[PDB]
Design a protein around this ligand. Sequence first.
Ligand SMILES: [Cl-]
Length: 162
Amino acid sequence: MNIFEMLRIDEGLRLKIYKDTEGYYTIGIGHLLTKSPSLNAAKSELDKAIGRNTNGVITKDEAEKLFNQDVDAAVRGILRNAKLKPVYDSLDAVRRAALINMVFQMGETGVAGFTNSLRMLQQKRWDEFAVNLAKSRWYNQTPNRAKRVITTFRTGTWDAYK
Ligand SMILES: [Cl-]
């Protein structure tokens, strides 16, 4: 099991534009198009991203390319984040995945603003960071997913995904 497997599951796969839970144009494996409410606008960005005239739909492979880049970008954003790095650098492998999953979902910045839960993760105080992350808009907006992620951080295992 690894980050790729993890997020594919957490995000699913769509070949067609779709709207998320926040109601945003999205595609593939949680690949955010635009926050704007113009399907057109979303079509353009999709085109720009795929590099061809898509007319709203991509292929699996296309989806997969966006995804690999999306995971790469998340990794680099972590490594480049002054708040994120050390955290990341201090966790074992399962947990870095979890850190990566959240960054994928909210952005360096977003994730970087959980400064209290970050310390805790730093102290390796699983149980409490966990309680802490739960008091998040994030946890209530999408509790099941949020729970897997948080369990993964807590335990440092993949049980939530098996
Ligand atoms: Cl792109």
